[PDB]
Design a protein around this nucleic acid. Structure first.
Ligand code: FES
Ligand code: K
Ligand code: K
Ligand code: MG
Ligand code: MG
Ligand code: MG
Ligand code: MG
Ligand code: MG
Ligand code: MG
Ligand code: MG
Ligand code: MG
Ligand code: MG
Ligand code: MG
Ligand code: MG
Ligand code: MG
Ligand code: MG
Ligand code: MG
Ligand code: MG
Ligand code: MG
Ligand code: MG
Ligand code: MG
Ligand code: MG
Ligand code: MG
Ligand code: MG
Ligand code: MG
Ligand code: MG
Ligand code: MG
Ligand code: MG
Ligand code: MG
Ligand code: MG
Ligand code: MG
Ligand code: MG
Ligand code: MG
Ligand code: MG
Ligand code: MG
Ligand code: MG
Ligand code: MG
Ligand code: MG
Ligand code: MG
Ligand code: MG
Ligand code: MG
Ligand code: MG
Ligand code: MG
Ligand code: MG
Lengths: 169, 77, 117, 109, 83, 213, 112
RNA sequence: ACAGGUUUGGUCCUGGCCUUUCUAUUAAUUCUUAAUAAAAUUACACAUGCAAGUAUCCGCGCCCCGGUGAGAAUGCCCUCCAGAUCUUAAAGAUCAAAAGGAGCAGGUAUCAAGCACACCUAUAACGGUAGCUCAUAACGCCUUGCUCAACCACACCCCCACGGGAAACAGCAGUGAUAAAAAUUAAGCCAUGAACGAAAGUUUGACUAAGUUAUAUUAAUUAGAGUUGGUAAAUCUCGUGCCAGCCACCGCGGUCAUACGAUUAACCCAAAUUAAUAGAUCCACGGCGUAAAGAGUGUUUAAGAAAAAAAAUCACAAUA
């Protein structure tokens, strides 16, 4: 990317390096911030940098912006059970907000690692089929077994043409 | 394969079936084996059925399930 | 595909090229084609012996009993295959074919000896 | 073209190719209607042996006979390709020699 | 072929051991106690062997399948000779 | 699934109503549906040919209604047996008729649907079930003086084993699991062959389905 | 305890467009969608119908919507929950004091 | 793209076309054998044979498999899921209609307005409100099966099929017509799959094993085709004389042609070679004084930016 103030933030790696996964009960995140004043530096930089990362890992979570409606910037979270979480940021920096959010509603490290561990067993190595879903496509791709007749022609004694000839004779 | 509405063939319209011959000694022994074979498999089938109920019940309202539910609720508060 | 009815069945799905059969132990709806969509693939069955003279069979025992527990029918060859492994008792037709082979072989031995003398 | 304008218009997509004189078919079969001679544009001057045939789609187009010498007459069946002759404007088909009623060029004897 | 005979050098990544715990105590690898029907030599199930049916049942089957009846056979041979 | 260009098809619903109305109005009667020619062994209505295993019984026996019409109240409370059970089962099997309604289409009144009480191998059920396989040419009627002879039954206890050994491979996993978890008992596992009782194939199935219980 | 809904959105926040119809407010929900080519997020606007029993909707408000367990028609599938920000009358959720943009209408450090 | 040929007397710049790479079909020339994969003109009309039976009568099954891409911007993903079926300890599972939506989804705005497309009360009437979709593309038009363990749709036609036209191979093989498109009117249920029977078992043009064809890949038994001015590997001797003819782009031939035709020699692929048509790929995160490009001007709506600092002007020919 050439255009833009920070073209690095518009690449796949930057969108993928942000690790903030909301719980299944989080649906709506509302962020209010001011475009003037030194107190809103943490909020504006959070919107300019971290929000694309948060949305990328949470495609089903609505994110809405509101500018210059409340003198004190804040974040509001709406849960599935109607619970409302209010986060107040007036001097916290860009990094502080992400760490604060990751603890109140983010998922634990043990939960994330065990989630993908259970996903691995879906692609069981012992299955056969297409390359997109299974490793091997046929039993002939296993050393020791009888190879595919296309590569190495089979012996005449096993060919069905020879088997039928002797039966009819 | 044929469909419901198509007419049947003409040559094979007179015959119905021709059952094969029955060996008296062999058939009775085979019938006895099937009766015991079906009974044994049925007990195994019901045994597996109860196993599924046990596994499903533990996943829904198992002791560990209550522990997990209370832990997240306690952490959230 | 939306079918009128049908029953869940564990069967063998053919594969491989000509003169080289290869069956996959799969569980699919009875009304779907042999190589059609399936729920879960259980194992595999190599019909041809390898250099060691072994016919490899793969079974997903914990998953196999799960589908049988929920009411899955079994075809003729899978029952014989399971009977050989010992998960199920020997099929009655497996034993009868064995007995027929002995009697035919006994007749063959007697027939050859009678002509010899 | 700023970011907003590029987003609105979407990525540029190559348009599909326009069908040629043969309507996308590699070869066509036609019936000879008239045989005449067409002359090229300068600085190339000659007497090019052309023909006017009606294709299987019903349209009537001008075609060209490659090689030296031909025995094509009216109401003959020939096969036409999709090649083009640079010297002759308008002509965009060539008869493939050796099929149906047109044979290969005859060696001098 | 040369790399398989060691005549040519090629990269050999370090590989971790296949199993985490090396225990032979489990019954999959250790010998299980013999079945009561295994030591005795009796077949695993009573119906595996051949039993002579009662003559009354044979008469009933002949009446039911009269006309299309086939020749009966006795007990199968215990061991099959080689041609 | 749906789209914004859905067209309100009406002929398909119109055909469904008429087709459903037609079959109800033109419902075939039991007499004409089961009328059979005794020479070609071909059903004129359905166009079906009976299997050769049933040719002998048709010409050498009569169905239920043929032996039931010549009775005062169509044999209410009578005992009806069937040739199929008699040939294969030494124990008496019979039906105690509760109600029967023949169809008036038949000129000879040889068709109809009947109910009864089931008595299989001396076991009597406490509910009435519709009689299955009425049209079969194998039914017989017991006499009044022989009613008590067949009614009397000698109860013989079952000698089948109540437990059988597990299959060999499946038996090993049972031992392996308890040994792994600490249960070191060497008692041989057994399979409870008590809940897997199988009725004989000749036992008639319930024609009526089962509602939610 | 079966009071679920078939829609993919349970709770949404949108801006009120108009209150022309009777006891129903048309709101505009905004969500961020990633453009596959530019890898940038742009707002996507969708219109939702919310049932207001008390007729408390004014054009320009921000309203939280709750999924309706049973649709009342082919379009109204959401019910109003609360008025997050009344137009022109905005109270700061932190200090609980009226405010007009950046300047506080009432000083929070003056209890009396 | 590692780029190359081509504007001009000539250089630089901008900007098209074409070459070089890979896959498929047909045709030309040529062709020895074996194996595997695949088999494709046509939703046009079809002779004949076959493709659903099983079973002690009841019953169950009978485009399920298979076939096709006509139709529809259809759809993909996803939420919910009645109902049918299987199993049984009546609560588990397989398939999933209808309905619904976070997002994604061909071309065209010279298709810009559609014209009832909304909602409330209670009723499931009546009455009341005057709204709804749309320049982030409504409403139209044109083209089209697909995002592939597979999915969606059609089953002679009148979107449907009471009815009517009318008398059906888009099941295998085969035939007519048509098209540049050319498999056997064959064998068996031995395996597997499906239907039925308690069961031995039966049926099965699905399939299995074969027949046919350089369509692709491999091995070997097999040798011809194209090209030789430049981009781009490679030639001489004759004939012809802007003539007959050649070229993918630039061009050649006007009595001394390495470009036409033939010959000698050479180059490059090889049981294939070359040509023709489609497809992969390819435009702008680049530009707007002179090149295609800042619209004659200002304000405002939709929308979007603010983030550090700082900013109400003014002798003079505005205008009416
Ligand atoms: S691909 Fe495995 S036998 Fe051919
Ligand atoms: K160029
Ligand atoms: K078969
Ligand atoms: Mg194959
Ligand atoms: Mg050319
Ligand atoms: Mg040129
Ligand atoms: Mg020819
Ligand atoms: Mg029938
Ligand atoms: Mg110039
Ligand atoms: Mg020049
Ligand atoms: Mg050809
Ligand atoms: Mg061949
Ligand atoms: Mg029966
Ligand atoms: Mg298909
Ligand atoms: Mg087509
Ligand atoms: Mg079409
Ligand atoms: Mg259309
Ligand atoms: Mg559905
Ligand atoms: Mg349900
Ligand atoms: Mg249910
Ligand atoms: Mg139709
Ligand atoms: Mg048909
Ligand atoms: Mg047709
Ligand atoms: Mg055909
Ligand atoms: Mg023909
Ligand atoms: Mg072809
Ligand atoms: Mg031909
Ligand atoms: Mg022939
Ligand atoms: Mg046949
Ligand atoms: Mg046979
Ligand atoms: Mg069979
Ligand atoms: Mg069965
Ligand atoms: Mg073949
Ligand atoms: Mg040559
Ligand atoms: Mg040439
Ligand atoms: Mg000369
Ligand atoms: Mg050249
Ligand atoms: Mg030459
Ligand atoms: Mg200009
Ligand atoms: Mg300019
Ligand atoms: Mg301008
Ligand atoms: Mg302007
Ligand atoms: Mg504004
Ligand atoms: Mg004036």
């Amino acid at each position: 990317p050439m255009k833009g103030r920070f073209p690095i933030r518009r690449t796949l790696q930057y969108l993928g390096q942000g690790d903030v996964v909301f719980k299944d009960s989080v649906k709506v995140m509302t962020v209010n911030y001011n475009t003037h004043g030194e107190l809103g530096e943490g909020a504006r930089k959070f919107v300019f940098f971290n929000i694309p990362q948060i949305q990328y890992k949470n495609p089903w979570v609505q994110i809405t912006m509101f500018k210059n409606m409340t003198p004190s910037p804040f974040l509001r979270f709406y849960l599935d059970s109607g619970e409302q979480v209010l986060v107040d940021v007036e001097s916290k920096s860009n990094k502080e907000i992400v760490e604060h959010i990751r603890k109140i509603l983010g998922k634990n490290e043990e939960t994330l690692e065990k989630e993908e561990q259970e996903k691995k067993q879906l692609s069981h190595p012992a299955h056969f089929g297409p390359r997109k879903y299974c490793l091997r496509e046929c039993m002939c791709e296993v050393e020791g077994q009888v190879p595919c007749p296309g590569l190495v022609p089979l012996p005449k004694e096993m060919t069905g043409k020879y088997k039928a000839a002797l039966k009819a004779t | 394969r044929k469909t419901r509405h198509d007419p049947p063939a003409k040559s094979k319209a007179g015959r119905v079936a021709t059952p094969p011959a029955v060996d008296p000694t062999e058939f009775f022994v085979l019938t006895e084996r099937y009766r015991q074979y079906r009974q044994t498999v049925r007990a195994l089938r019901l045994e597996f059925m109860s196993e599924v109920r046990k596994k499903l019940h533990e996943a829904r309202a198992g002791v560990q399930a209550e522990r997990k539910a209370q832990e997240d609720a306690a952490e959230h508060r | 595909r939306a079918y009128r009815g049908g029953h869940l069945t564990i069967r063998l799905a053919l594969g491989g090229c000509t003169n080289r059969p290869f069956y996959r132990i799969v569980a699919a709806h009875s009304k779907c084609p042999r190589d059609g969509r399936f729920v879960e693939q259980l194992g595999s069955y190599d019909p041809l012996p390898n250099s060691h003279g072994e016919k490899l069979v793969a079974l997903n025992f914990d998953r196999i009993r799960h589908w049988i527990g929920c009411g899955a029918h079994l075809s003729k060859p899978v029952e014989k295959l399971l009977g050989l492994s010992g998960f199920y008792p020997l099929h009655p037709m497996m034993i009868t074919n064995a007995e027929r082979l002995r009697r035919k072989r006994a007749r063959e031995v007697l027939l050859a000896s009678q002509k010899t003398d | 073209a700023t970011l907003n304008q590029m987003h609105r218009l979407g990525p540029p997509k190559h348009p599909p190719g326009k069908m040629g004189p043969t309507a996308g078919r590699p070869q066509l079969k036609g019936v000879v209607l008239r045989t005449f001679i067409r002359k090229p544009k300068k600085p190339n001057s000659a007497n090019r042996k052309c023909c006017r045939v009606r294709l299987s789609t019903g349209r009537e187009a001008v075609c060209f006979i490659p090689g030296e010498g031909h025995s094509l007459q009216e109401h003959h069946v020939v096969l036409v390709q999709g090649g083009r002759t640079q010297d002759l404007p308008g002509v965009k088909l060539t008869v493939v020699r050796g099929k149906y009623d047109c044979g290969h060029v005859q060696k001098k004897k | 072929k040369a790399r398989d005979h060691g005549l040519l050098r090629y990269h050999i990544p370090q590989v971790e051991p296949r199993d985490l715990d090396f225990s032979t105590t489990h019954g999959a690898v250790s010998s299980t106690p013999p079945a009561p029907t295994l030591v005795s030599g009796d077949p695993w199930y009573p119906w595996y062997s051949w039993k002579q049916p009662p003559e009354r049942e044979l008469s009933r089957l002949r009446r039911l399948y009269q006309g299309r009846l086939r020749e009966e056979s006795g007990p199968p041979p215990e061991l099959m000779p080689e041609v | 699934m749906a789209r914004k260009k859905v067209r309100p098809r009406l002929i398909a619903e119109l055909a469904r109503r008429v087709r459903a109305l037609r079959e109800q109005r033109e419902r075939p009667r039991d007499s004409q549906r089961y009328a059979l020619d005794y020479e070609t062994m071909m059903r004129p209505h359905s166009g079906n040919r009976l299997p050769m295993r049933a040719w002998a019984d048709v010409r050498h026996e009569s169905r239920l209604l043929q032996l039931l019409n010549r009775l005062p109240l169509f044999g209410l409370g009578r005992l009806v047996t069937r040739k199929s059970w008699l040939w294969q089962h030494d124990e008496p099997c019979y039906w105690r008729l509760t109600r029967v309604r023949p169809d008036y289409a038949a000129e000879n009144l040889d068709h109809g649907k009947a109910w009864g009480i089931l008595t299989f191998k001396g076991k009597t059920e406490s509910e009435a079930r519709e009689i299955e396989q009425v049209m079969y040419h194998d039914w017989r009627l017991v006499p009044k003086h022989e009613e008590e002879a067949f009614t009397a039954f000698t109860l013989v206890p079952e000698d089948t084993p109540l437990s059988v050994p597990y299959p060999p491979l499946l038996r090993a996993m049972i031992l392996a699991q308890r040994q792994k978890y600490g249960d070191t008992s060497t008692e041989e596992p057994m399979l409870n062959l008590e809940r897997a009782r199988i009725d004989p194939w000749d036992y008639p199935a319930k024609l009526e389905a089962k509602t939610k219980t | 305890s079966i009071a679920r809904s078939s829609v993919h959105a349970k709770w949404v926040v949108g801006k009120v467009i108009g209150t022309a119809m009777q006891k129903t407010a048309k709101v505009r929900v905004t969500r961020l969608v990633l453009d596959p080519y530019l890898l940038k997020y742009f707002n996507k606007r969708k219109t939702y119908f919310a049932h207001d029993a008390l007729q408390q909707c004014t054009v320009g408000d921000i309203v939280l919507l709750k999924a309706l367990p049973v649709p009342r028609t082919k379009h109204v599938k959401h019910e109003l929950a609360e008025i997050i920000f009344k137009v022109g009358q905005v109270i700061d959720p932190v200090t609980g004091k009226p405010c007009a943009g950046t300047t506080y209408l009432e000083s929070p450090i003056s209890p009396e």
